[PDB]
Every structure is written in structure tokens, then in C-alpha cells.
Design a protein around this ligand. Structure first.
Ligand SMILES: Nc1ncnc2c1ncn2[C@@H]1O[C@H](COP(=O)(O)OP(=O)(O)O)[C@@H](O)[C@H]1O
Ligand SMILES: Nc1ncnc2c1ncn2[C@@H]1O[C@H](COP(=O)(O)OP(=O)(O)O)[C@@H](O)[C@H]1O
Ligand SMILES: [Ca+2]
Ligand SMILES: [Ca+2]
Ligand SMILES: [Ca+2]
Ligand SMILES: [Mg+2]
Ligand SMILES: [Mg+2]
Lengths: 126, 74, 160, 371, 371
């Protein structure tokens, strides 16, 4: 039939996909929160001797330095991936630039104003 | 000095993400507070690493998509 | 225009007679109920305007499914409401790309007919396989069984 | 909001909102004060009719164009033209719309700086950008290479571009254009008895040129044919009767483009300045420029020019290269269509000269990075 | 896993996986930044086109080779070339593949150490090994003795080998190669009127040299013949038309190899440095080296060189010895084929410079036992 019902079907698909993306993102956020809570070792900061407290804090600082190094490495890797995918997008545009520029739609002059002027209030859609 | 820049940046991060720490002149409460600072910093680093993992997954997927599109374009 | 067309579409067929009467009020002398380039030019000149007949025939061909260059009654309504343009920017490119990227469950960089079937089943709206076939035809330009990202944009072109 | 794509030009001001197909309002750029005395009282007689209003009362006015050759010679009149364009032909206050003017290549700096100063102080636009009239005409063709010959009404310029990299050392700007052809036609019409002198009758001669003149494929054969038969003599009715018959003045007026020695100019025709502009380019992009020669501007609308120019260049160029001349039917508004496309781009949205930037560096900002 | 047999070369980078017959991707090693301004917005213009992409946009670039004479003079550009080679021409991440670079004899140490440091730090390969470019060309011929003359595009070197024992005191490295022949051809073409100056037109002169030039069997007779008849004048069509006719420039360009006095170099030709390299060897292996003279490298592809060189050496050598010149049809890729064979050997599998070894001794590990 016409594209009105087909357009309705397409918009329904778009809404369903958006709902699924939002749901998946929320699930990812919850899973990430739980996983992060799992990763970091809980604190045990009671009843510890003063020197024992200092030694434990030093151990925590050493582990913090280790995690800093690891996460800096991961950050550098992700930065390299970002740069490489930016280059890939550049190549994508190179293979898809040229004549593939969408154009605006302004060829139609104002028509509602003329209809109202020449017919009074008989044009109510716009 | 690009590789030297990366090495020095990393070494600074060692002395930057971890400043000069002296746990000897601090009372028990201060030691507990600093230890929790370290703990929460590590937790934040874990969060950032997880974000990086997600971003890397997206980057891989989009890179594959771009490869497919490039192959199609020819 | 198109939004107003869909909104008024929930009324009875007498509104078509009302619009025919309005067009008669404009350019009385109509006899066929279809807007050709002659009548459109005449009514716009009476208004004080002049749209190109190339635009009119392009609008005729865009909705032309049987290739007749003419309009059925509801097709006449569609052509009549095509005289104005409101669908600007076609929703949002980035969100559409995100949705298309989430569509690829197998992450093969394409959307095959099976993924389309699964998504339609997830939608749940009253559909027929004919609608699915039409969607696949409008989406898969090269008929390779998959949807290209450029082909996905073309299929989602002018879509809010 | 939407951007205003104005295009001053010289002879026709073309304007309209960005994102459409054709300019909204196209009207001659002439400002004519009345010259007689005026005896009716209370008739509501204004002191200056601008735009298309002065093409209807031209019988008692002294029309004078405010733009001579690309450059602007009378700033008050140009300001009046801009004010009319904004307020009466588009009816949009400039306080809420970016503007995209156009300027010929190799023009004086002071002209461009004064243009931006006016747009920022008098009309008080949010942001304006000035673009070279040939790059837009290349946008409209949907290409990215090619050498574009934009023969307007003021000045004819020939900008070669490859892969988006303009070649600034190969721009050949020539000051022969439609206005000189109008004057030469008005000068050769006197050989039959018709004398047009008044600045109002220049418009009539322009109409004759537009409706009758055409470019001959071969000049000598046409001169010989028109001197023996009478199959060329086309008649035309003046605004008062007394039809006139144009003989071999038909193809002699636009022939001046290919032989500027007719009006005493030394330089070579538009058929040879294009070849010279190509030969200044590098040796490896000459094939692409040969294959993508683009025509634009109003004066390139003569019937039969896209064949004469191709024949001439094929005569000049090496025999192996293919010579192709792109002549879209929408030639006249090609620059403005390209301007609309450029203003509608997302990547271009941060190149505008924002007002705070002008406040910090003065009008000389236009020559800076924001070109 | 499989090994990556890269071969930097100077003029053409040849790479491919170990165990095949021909390199997978062969492309010029040039990195050219754009030099003009660029007016089209959003065209997606990059800042440096490397490899074979810059041989198609060379009309608006300034190509510059990152390797002058074997040695590497611009490390950033060389890193860019390697990155392109790994990621776009082979599409294999280097984290999972050993690499086998090649290096000319008698090159500066710092070049080799920097090469290994880059390969281990930036690309982070598992293990890399550097091999002399002549031993590989001897591998590809399936011999185990012989004196190989590897006249590349950067540098011509002549390594004699007997029974697998290289003779380090008899390597004669000469810096005349294909690039100097291109420059000399570009310099003698000016004697007819054709002037090539731009760094892009050097590529056109290189194409002329490849397609037309040949080595004369006897120089004086050819000079006399080309000066009387006209049977030698071969024409060639430039990238834009205007065919050119090369006369006795055909065999005068590659004659520079046998008379380096043409370009002002003092040393003796490639016909006499081979004989000198042989005479430095011991008295008992000279017959075998005479009988197994091997040619390799790109520049030894001139039509008629395997006869001129044999005639010259037979003139120099004692009359009893047999002079034989091995000129396989796959001369250009001989070094890379040999590299593939060497990387495919089981006995060689423990000679790689493993990463832990580099971590313990620094980049100076390459001069050590792992050569
Ligand atoms: N159909 C036509 N045939 C011949 N000449 C024309 C035609 N239309 C316009 N011209 C000439 O071109 C001029 C208009 O050129 P135009 O492109 O408007 O200049 P600008 O670049 O200043 O806008 C007029 O002065 C007229 O002489
Ligand atoms: N068919 C040919 N005829 C003559 N000269 C050639 C031919 N092919 C290549 N050359 C010359 O050899 C050079 C390529 O040499 P090559 O062996 O690739 O050097 P490298 O040792 O750096 O790889 C080119 O610059 C060219 O001048
Ligand atoms: Ca129909
Ligand atoms: Ca899929
Ligand atoms: Ca498809
Ligand atoms: Mg113009
Ligand atoms: Mg080599």
C-alpha cells in the first residue's frame, strides 16, 4: 500500500530499537557497578596496630601505583584505537565524500501564507 | 622525544597519581583516611578501565563495520 | 503537512470532498480530481507563486509505485499534502547509527533478513510478511541479503 | 536558525535562505534618483527607487549601478541596496541571521573590509563569511576538481581547483563581462540607425542582447552567410512600437568574448585564458582539468557557447586529451546554489566570523584565518 | 605463526609473509605533504599521503623519499611508512609476527640500532632480525658461492661469498644507483628542450628511464649510429599529451653505471669494481667467483646489461677463466624471495632477536652474536 503505514512500521521499529538500546545500556551500567564493587578489595580499617596501619597503607599505595600503571597502559591502548578508528573514518569519508553530500529542501516557497491570503481561513492544516 | 615523552609521562603518573606519601607522622584517623583515599582511587581506576574496555569493544565493532563498508564501496 | 496529513487521516472520506471543494474555491474548473502541473501552476499563479513542473513531476514519481504518473484518490491526497515540506533533518543521524549498530546482534557489520525478522517479532505490531518483503526491498538495494550502512541511511532517509 | 545566502553580484542581486534550490528574490541592483522637477503635490514621490521598482519607473530616472567591476564604487548606494534586500524582499531582520556574501577573486582588500564593517555595524548581523564566487559554482556542480570559468556581468574570472586544493597562482581574472558586451552592442547598433544613449535605454539594449544574440560556431562563415542571405535578420519590438531588425549584429556582440580586440582590450579571449590558466597548473593534473571544465555565471548563457568554447580548446589542447565542458541548465544561479549548499554544511558551521572575534581584531579579521 | 619478511629498500618497499613466491604489497616509499592551500571544506583532506596513494595525487604534493642512500635520514617519515605497510597493505597487527628487515652493507650503526629500537618499542614485534641484502639475493639463486652485485635504487654493493663464508674485506660499496641515473637522465633531457624540475616530474622521468633506456653493447658504435641514422628515436607520451622523442639519451643514461665520470664520480664502473672485488679474494676461489657472478636488484634490469657486463669482465679477466653472469628473470624481487626462503628455514628459527634479550642488553644487541 502507501508508505504511511510503512512509515508507521519503520517508526515502530525505531522506537523498539531505542528502547532496547536504553535497556541494554542500563543493564551494562548495573553490571559494571557490581563488577567494579567486586574488583576492588574491601577495606578493613579497624583494630589494627599503628605501625600495622602504616604498613598496610604503604601496601595500598604500592597497589595503587600498580593500578595506575595498568590503567595508564589501557588508556594509551584505547587512545591508539581512537586515533586508528579516526583514521578509518577519514578513509571512509575519502571513499564516501565527493558527490555524496545531502542537500537541503527549500525549493518550495511558502505556500500556506499565500493560501491564507487568497482564501481567508479556509486552509486550516497550515 | 616522543617515546621519551611517553616514558616520562608514565613515570610522572607514578609520582603524580601517587604523590609523596608519608604515613609515619599521621595519627590513626589520618592513616585510615589516606588508606581509604587510595582504595577509592583504585576503585575509580577500575571504573575508568571498564569504560576503556567498553570503548575498545565499540571501536572494534565500528572498525569492522567500516571495513565492510569500504569493501562494499569498491 | 505530512504530520497534518496523518492526523486528519483519522477522519472520514468526506474530507476529500471538502478538499476538492477548497481546490474548486481556488481554481474552479477542475474536472478530474487530480492535480496536474497545469492546475498546480494556475493555482499558484493565482496565489502569486510558481513551483517548477520538474518539482511536481519529481513528487509524482517519488510516490509512484505503479509507475503511472497519476494518483489514486488517497494517492491524490498524498500528492496534495506533498505540496509542503516539514520533515527536516530526518530525526538524528547519530542515534540512528547507534540503533543500526545495536541491530547487528552477530556484529557482522550487516543486517540480514533474519535479524529484520527478529526485530519485527520484537516489535509485535500487527504485520504481514508482505510488509516485511516491502521493507526488505526498500532496505536491501543490492539484494545481497544484508543492509549496508549507506543502504541503511537510504532506507532511513527522510525518516523521523 | 537559518543562514542568509546573499550574493551581491553586479547586475542582479540574488538572495535567499540557505537550503533551498533557487534564490527567493532576484532583482537588478540599480538605484535611480528622479531627474525631472515634479509638479503633482502629494503624489508620494520618493527620493530614490532601488531594485525592481526602478525598472518600472525608469522612464524618468537616472539608473546607476553601485558596483562597477566586482569592486564597489559607491558605498552609500550599496548600503541602500542591502537594506532593501534584507527588509523588503526577504522581510527578515538581520539581527537574527548569519550572512554569506560572495566576492570576486583578486579584489581590493578595502572593499572586503568595508563590506564586513558595514555588515557588522549597520545591519548588526550575528556572523558573516565571505567566499570566492568560483568555489561555490564548483560546489553546485557536485564536483571536487575542475577549472571554473565564471563569466558574470561585472568581471570574468577563471579559478582552477584540484581535489579541493585551489591553485592561487593560476587565477586569471579578466575584466570583460556582460556590461562591456551591452555597451559594444549599443555601439554597433548605431550602424543601422538606432541610437540608444540614455542610461535607461541601456536596459533596452540589454534586453535585445539577452533575447536575440547568440555565439557563432565559426565566425567567418557566419559573417559571409549574413552578408548574402537574409535568414538571420530577427526583428524585435521596442517598448513603444517601431520594430527593429538586427542583422549580423546578432553574433558580433558576443563574439567580443573570444576576440577582446573588438572593444580595444589587449588580452586574449575566454577561449585562450582558460588554456593559459590550465598550462600554469602542474603537469599531472592537466588531464583532470581538461575533462572537467565548468561554465557558470550569467554571460555564459548565450545559445551555442558550449560548442564554440569546446572547439577552440580542442584546437589549442593536445590531440589526445578529452575536452569536456560542463554547462548545467541552471547556470545563472549556480553560484547561489553552491552558496546554499556550503551554508547548509555541518562541517562549515564553525568557520563563520563571530561578532566577538570582530570586536577583538577589527575589520581586518577577514584576511586572517577566517578567510 | 608466520614471519613478516619486510624489505625497506629505497624506492620500493616490498613486503609479504614468509614462504610465498612474490611480495604481497609493493609500493613506492614516498611521503608527500600537500603544498597548496585548499579551499573545499569537508573534502576529507589528510596531512600526508604515503605509499601508492601519493603516486596518484602527486600533482599537488611534494614527494620526498625518507631513505637517501641506504641510510635513513628522516625517522618520522620512515615510521609512518612502516605503520602504513603493516596496517593497510598487509592488515596484520605486528604484535603477533616476527619481522626480518634488510640492510645494505657498511651502513652506519646508529641506523640499524634505531631501526631495531623502533621495531621493538613502537610496533612492539615479538622478535626481529636484520640481514645483509646480498646474502638473501644469493639464497634466492639457490647457490652457495658466487659474488653478487646488488645494484638497487639507493646504493650498489658487491658482496663476494664462498662456500657460505662471506669475505668481509672484499665488500665494495658504491653509492651510484638508480636515483642518480634518474637525475642524470633528467639533466640530459634538457638538451632537447624538455625541462623537468618539480619533485613530481622526477617520477615521470623515472618512468621514461624504465620504459625506454637500455644499455649499449658497445658505446662508441652506438654513439656513431645514433648520430647518423634515426632508427633509435623512440617516442613517449607524457601524462598530458605532447609526445617526446628520445634520441641518443636512451643508452647514455644507463651508461653512467660503467663510466661514473659522467656524473662527476671518481670511482670505476660496476664492470671494474666487480673485478677488483674478486681480485681481493684469495687466489684459489677466484675461478668459482668468476663462474658464478650473480646480478640482482632493480637497476640491473636494463635490456642488454648481462651482455655488456660479461664482455667487460672477459676483457679484464684472464683469458682462460670462464665468465658467466647469472641474471634470473625475477631479478627485482630476488632479495625478497631470498628473505622468504631464509625466514622459512628451520635451522634459522633460533637466530631471531627475542624481546627479552633486547630488554636485557638494549638496542646494541644487534651488533652482538645475534647479528
Ligand atoms: N539568458 C541570457 N542570455 C544572454 N545573456 C544573459 C542572459 N541572462 C543574463 N545575461 C547577462 O548576464 C548578466 C547577469 O549576470 P549575473 O550572473 O547575474 O551577474 P552576477 O555574477 O553579478 O550575478 C546580465 O547583465 C546579462 O547581460
Ligand atoms: N624494468 C626496469 N628497467 C629499468 N630500471 C628499473 C626497472 N625497474 C626498476 N628500475 C629501477 O630500479 C629502481 C627500483 O630498485 P629496487 O630494487 O626496488 O630498489 P631497492 O633495492 O630499494 O628495492 C627504480 O627506482 C628504477 O629506477
Ligand atoms: Ca499512479
Ligand atoms: Ca547481523
Ligand atoms: Ca544490500
Ligand atoms: Mg556572479
Ligand atoms: Mg634492494
Amino acid at each position: 500500500i502507501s508508505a504511511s503505514r510503512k512509515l508507521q512500521l519503520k517508526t515502530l521499529m525505531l522506537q523498539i530499537a531505542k528502547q532496547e538500546m536504553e535497556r541494554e545500556a542500563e543493564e551494562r551500567r548495573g553490571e559494571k557497578g557490581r563488577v567494579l564493587r567486586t574488583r576492588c578489595q574491601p577495606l578493613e580499617l579497624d583494630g589494627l596496630g599503628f605501625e600495622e596501619l602504616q604498613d598496610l597503607c604503604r601496601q595500598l599505595h604500592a597497589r595503587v601505583d600498580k593500578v595506575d600503571e595498568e590503567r595508564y597502559d589501557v588508556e594509551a591502548k584505547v587512545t591508539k584505537n581512537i586515533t586508528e578508528i579516526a583514521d578509518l573514518t577519514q578513509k571512509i569519508y575519502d571513499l564516501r565524500g565527493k558527490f555524496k553530500r545531502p542537500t537541503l529542501r527549500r525549493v518550495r516557497i511558502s505556500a500556506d501564507a499565500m493560501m491564507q491570503a487568497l482564501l481567508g481561513t479556509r486552509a486550516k492544516e497550515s | 622525544g616522543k617515546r621519551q615523552t611517553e616514558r616520562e609521562k608514565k613515570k610522572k603518573i607514578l609520582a603524580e597519581r601517587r604523590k609523596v606519601l608519608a604515613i609515619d607522622h599521621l595519627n590513626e584517623d589520618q592513616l585510615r583516611e589516606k588508606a581509604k583515599e587510595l582504595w577509592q582511587s583504585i576503585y575509580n581506576l577500575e571504573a575508568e578501565k571498564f569504560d576503556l574496555q567498553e570503548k575498545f569493544k565499540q571501536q572494534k565493532y565500528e572498525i569492522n563495520v567500516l571495513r565492510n563498508r569500504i569493501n562494499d564501496n569498491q | 503537512d505530512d504530520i497534518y496529513k496523518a492526523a486528519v487521516e483519522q477522519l472520514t472520506e468526506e474530507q476529500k470532498n471538502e478538499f476538492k471543494a477548497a481546490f474548486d474555491i481556488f481554481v474552479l474548473g477542475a474536472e478530474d480530481g487530480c492535480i496536474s502541473t497545469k492546475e498546480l501552476g494556475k493555482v499558484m499563479r493565482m496565489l502569486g507563486q510558481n513551483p517548477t513542473p520538474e518539482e511536481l513531476q519529481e513528487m509524482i514519481d517519488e510516490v509512484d509505485e505503479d509507475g503511472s504518473g497519476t494518483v489514486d484518490f488517497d494517492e491524490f491526497l498524498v500528492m496534495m499534502v506533498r505540496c509542503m515540506k516539514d520533515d527536516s533533518k530526518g530525526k538524528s543521524e547519530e542515534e540512528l547509527s547507534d540503533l543500526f549498530r545495536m541491530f547487528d546482534k552477530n556484529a557482522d557489520g550487516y543486517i540480514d533478513l533474519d535479524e529484520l525478522k527478529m526485530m519485527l517479532q520484537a516489535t509485535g505490531e500487527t504485520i504481514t510478511e508482505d510488509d516485511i518483503e516491502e521493507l526488505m526491498k526498500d532496505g536491501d538495494k543490492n539484494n545481497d541479503g544484508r543492509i549496508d550502512y549507506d543502504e541503511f541511511l537510504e532506507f532511513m532517509k527522510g525518516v523521523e | 536558525t537559518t543562514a542568509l545566502v546573499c550574493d551581491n553580484g553586479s547586475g542582479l542581486v540574488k538572495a535567499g535562505f540557505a537550503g533551498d534550490d533557487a534564490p527567493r528574490a532576484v532583482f537588478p541592483s540599480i538605484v535611480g534618483r528622479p531627474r525631472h522637477q515634479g509638479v503633482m503635490v502629494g503624489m508620494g514621490q520618493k527620493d530614490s527607487y532601488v531594485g525592481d521598482e526602478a525598472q518600472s519607473k525608469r522612464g524618468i530616472l537616472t539608473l546607476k549601478y553601485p558596483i562597477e567591476h566586482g569592486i564597489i564604487t559607491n558605498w552609500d548606494d550599496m548600503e541602500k541596496i542591502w537594506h532593501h534586500t534584507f527588509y523588503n524582499e526577504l522581510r527578515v531582520a538581520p539581527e537574527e541571521h548569519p550572512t554569506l556574501l560572495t566576492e570576486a577573486p583578486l579584489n581590493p582588500k578595502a572593499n572586503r573590509e568595508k563590506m564586513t564593517q558595514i555588515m557588522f555595524e549597520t545591519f548588526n548581523v550575528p556572523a558573516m563569511y565571505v567566499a570566492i564566487q568560483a568555489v561555490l559554482s564548483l560546489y553546485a556542480s557536485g564536483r571536487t576538481t575542475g577549472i571554473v570559468l565564471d563569466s558574470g556581468d561585472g568581471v570574468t574570472h577563471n579559478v582552477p581547483i584540484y581535489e579541493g586544493y585551489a591553485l592561487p597562482h593560476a587565477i586569471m581574472r579578466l575584466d570583460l563581462a556582460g556590461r562591456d558586451l551591452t555597451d559594444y552592442l549599443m555601439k554597433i547598433l548605431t550602424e543601422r540607425g538606432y541610437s540608444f544613449v540614455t542610461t535607461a535605454e541601456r536596459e533596452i539594449v540589454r534586453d535585445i542582447k539577452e533575447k536575440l544574440c547568440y555565439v557563432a560556431l565559426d565566425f567567418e562563415n557566419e559573417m559571409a552567410t549574413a552578408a548574402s542571405s537574409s535568414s538571420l535578420e530577427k526583428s524585435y519590438e521596442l517598448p513603444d512600437g517601431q520594430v527593429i531588425t538586427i542583422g549580423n549584429e546578432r553574433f558580433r556582440c558576443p563574439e567580443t568574448l573570444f576576440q577582446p580586440s573588438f572593444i580595444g582590450m589587449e588580452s586574449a579571449g575566454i577561449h585562450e585564458t582558460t588554456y593559459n590558466s590550465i598550462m600554469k597548473c602542474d603537469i599531472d593534473i592537466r588531464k583532470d582539468l581538461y575533462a572537467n571544465n565548468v561554465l557558470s555565471g550569467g554571460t555564459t548563457m548565450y545559445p551555442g557557447i558550449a560548442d564554440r568554447m569546446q572547439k577552440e580548446i580542442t584546437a589549442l589542447a593536445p590531440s589526445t586529451m578529452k575536452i569536456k565542458i560542463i554547462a548545467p541548465p541552471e547556470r545563472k544561479y549556480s553560484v547561489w546554489i553552491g552558496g546554499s549548499i556550503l551554508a547548509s554544511l555541518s562541517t562549515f558551521q564553525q568557520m563563520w566570523i563571530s561578532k566577538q572575534e570582530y570586536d577583538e581584531a577589527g575589520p581586518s579579521i577577514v584576511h586572517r584565518k577566517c578567510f
